[PDB]
Design a protein around this ligand. Sequence first.
Ligand code: SO9
Length: 283
Amino acid sequence: FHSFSFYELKNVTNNFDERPISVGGNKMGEGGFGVVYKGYVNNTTVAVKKLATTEELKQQFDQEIKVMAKCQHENLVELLGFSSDGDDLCLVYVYMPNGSLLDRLSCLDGTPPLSWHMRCKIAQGAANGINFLHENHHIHRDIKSANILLDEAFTAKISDFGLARASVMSRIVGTTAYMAPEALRGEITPKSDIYSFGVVLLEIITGLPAVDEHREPQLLLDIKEEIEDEEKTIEDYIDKKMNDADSTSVEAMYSVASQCLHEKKNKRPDIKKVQQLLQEMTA
Ligand SMILES: NC(=O)[C@@H]1[C@H](Nc2nc(Nc3cccc(C(=O)N4CCCC4)c3)nc3ccsc23)[C@H]2C=C[C@@H]1C2
């Protein structure tokens, strides 16, 4: 990695301006380590995470580094460096031009809807990123659409490794709308990551967020039960902001989603099967 001065990062982010990009400032959004800022260093656009308890935050800071030191891959975000010298710890990444899957699915800041063809490639890439992490004996613990970033060619890039673990069952963490039953109870298994990817795939098919309090069902994973009981079909939930979806491949992706969302962890497919199933979709 390169090493950055805190005051260099403070300088190139307009003294950490927290108002959004469109109004004038540098806040791109908010994640696991709070606010992420846009900046420019070494003739290169960069995302800066400012890691603002303080003791528990440093453990997550080192985890992001220890994971991103060894684990370099096509479908994982890239850490360019870090800063420890100033008041708070910081992490610098290569800026992903198209932001998060979540924001593009909701068309935040007026971006055009993602096509079905685009959505499939993203599904595949995300699975490939998750596959690399499981091959290298890592569990993410926070797979969700906010943590899948999209590059200049809409390549899926998995991010946020603060809550990741290397390789069990008293500190339960993650985002409850995406977490499996056993993870909510406190189990640390790579099978929990497959469940969450199940929900992420339902977001891709439907363009609906995992949770919405102004909606029935409030949790997106409950549509699986609506479809199995034949009250509604998957075709009734397909995102209407696409002009290029077809039934077969959508049903194919929903089948992968449905198998991922099995409540019994040992009956879910492993990531290599999910990856194989999603390749058979496009082929
Ligand atoms: N899991 C996350 O940390 C998410 C995201 N983090 C990042 N975002 C971006 N890119 C980004 C973000 C927002 C806007 C735009 C943008 O310019 N456009 C123009 C066309 C449409 C979008 C680009 N790059 C990186 C690189 C390393 S982390 C990261 C942020 C949003 C939600 C959180 C914080």
